[PDB]
């Protein structure tokens, strides 16, 4: 089938900047391609259809061009309303194929996360379970790694992470890591550690506690 | 106009089937094709197949041949898509599109999970660890089904410095967690509560964040 190679996969922009997203087809697709935008939790909104026809209602700052295998969506001047994920769609031949998409996010200075670890609540513990939560709040870029270590060695399963979307005011991201175990397994160990690794530093930000402490 | 409206969210048991609908408005229903696209966090966008309401012609993705069935109905200008033998890998948001117009999508969840109220827990700073101008408190909404479950702080009063993270599937049920940050002298002098309501099970819980030890 036709493969749509889209680039760049990620893009850190600035309001009012000129953006150029590009899609290359594995073969000629004769202008039968569309560019659509999709915001978190929302549905796709088409910007242009048939390579360069502007969708009715879509602002003119959006334009597309291309002819055989190479098409480009250009955004004259980026507005806040534009952040989201842009995708190209080829419909020259079935199966219909989409590009991997490009993620646009507002640029800002690198910011380390603010890490905080939370031992199980006595209410949960008096229920059989034991969840060790650990928030990594307000950092940039969205790229971050979380690692857990019980009594010195790493824990792999029991962990569940959830990322928020770039904040509209400070342009940072936040994530929550929940290492779940059993009360009976939680009490077979002492020092639970929470480690965050992020571009803002070589050494990780380490946060932890000990049961023998509280 | 230019519209496509899809049927509501679907909660269906594995092994069962579902039939989704796509009502077309603002254009001549029998001049364009209507296609269906699947979208999941893990797998992304996937074209399922198309249908021309005019000729009744269809085209499917080899992956859905014998799994998905497309039909259209001239009288109600509605496109239909039926999925059979559902099995969690089919849990996804499904869209109908005219290639240019997109529907708002239909969310389908395939689970055996029965309605279950959320157990709310109060997260409190690790004994001591307040070294700083601010203090982060937390809230954990574990073991519920189905979504959603709105959660606010101090009956809504506290809205700044709050991060409610997206729920996640934890062994059949859903788990969510929120964090809020206030200046160090604010808490614990002034009470901070986490409000968790679960429309589904008609649950109204309030967890007061009390210090440890």
């Amino acid at each position: 089938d036709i493969k749509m190679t889209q680039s760049p996969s990620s893009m850190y922009t600035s309001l009012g900047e000129r953006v150029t997203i590009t899609c290359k087809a594995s073969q000629d697709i004769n202008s039968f391609l569309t560019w659509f935008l999709q915001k978190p939790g929302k549905s796709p909104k088409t910007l242009i259809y048939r390579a360069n026809r502007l969708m009715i209602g879509v602002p003119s700052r959006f334009s597309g061009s291309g002819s055989g295998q190479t098409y480009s969506l250009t955004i004259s001047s980026l507005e806040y309303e534009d952040m989201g994920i842009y995708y190209c769609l080829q419909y020259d031949d079935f199966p219909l194929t989409f590009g991997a998409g490009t993620k646009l996010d507002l640029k800002r200075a690198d910011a380390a996360p603010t890490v905080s670890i939370f031992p199980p609540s006595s209410e949960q513990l008096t229920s059989g379970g034991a969840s060790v939560v650990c928030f990594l709040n307000n950092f940039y870029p969205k790229e971050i790694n979380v690692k857990w270590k019980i009594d010195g060695s790493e824990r792999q399963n029991g962990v569940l992470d959830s990322w928020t979307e770039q904040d509209s005011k400070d342009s940072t991201y936040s994530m929550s890591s929940t290492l779940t175990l059993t009360k009976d397994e939680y009490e077979r160990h002492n020092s639970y550690t929470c480690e965050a690794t992020h571009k803002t530093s070589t050494s990780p930000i380490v946060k932890s506690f000990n049961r023998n402490e509280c | 106009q230019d519209q496509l409206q899809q049927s509501g969210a679907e909660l269906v048991r594995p092994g069962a089937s579902v039939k989704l609908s796509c009502k077309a408005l603002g254009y001549i229903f029998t001049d364009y094709e209507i296609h269906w696209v699947k979208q999941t966090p893990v797998h992304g966008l996937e074209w399922i197949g198309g249908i021309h309401p005019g000729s009744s012609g269809t085209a499917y993705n080899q992956k859905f041949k014998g799994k998905a069935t497309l039909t259209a109905d001239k009288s109600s200008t509605t496109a239909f898509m039926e999925l059979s033998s559902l099995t969690s890998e089919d849990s996804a948001v499904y869209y109908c599109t005219r290639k240019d117009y997109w529907g708002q999508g239909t969310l389908v969840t395939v689970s055996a999970a029965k309605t279950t109220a959320p157990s709310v827990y109060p997260l409190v700073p690790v004994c001591g660890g307040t070294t700083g101008s601010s203090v982060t408190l937390g809230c954990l909404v574990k073991g519920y089904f189905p979504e959603p479950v709105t959660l606010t702080w101090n009956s809504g009063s506290l809205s700044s410095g709050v991060h409610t993270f997206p729920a996640l599937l934890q062994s059949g049920l859903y788990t969510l967690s929120s964090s809020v940050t206030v200046t160090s002298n604010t808490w614990p002098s002034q009470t901070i509560t986490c409000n968790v309501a679960h429309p589904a099970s008609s649950t109204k819980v309030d967890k007061k964040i009390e210090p440890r030890v």
């Binding site: 039968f32 259809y49 048939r50 026809r53 969708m55 009715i56 419909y91 020259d92 079935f94 | 230019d2 001049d31 364009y32 094709e33 198309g50 021309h52 005019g54 000729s55 012609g57 269809t58 085209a59 005219r98 290639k99 240019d100």
Partner: peptide
């Protein structure tokens, strides 16, 4: 706005 130039090749 757009015509069957959405490649309406039936199927």
């Amino acid at each position: 706005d757009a015509t069957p130039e959405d490649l309406n090749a039936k199927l």
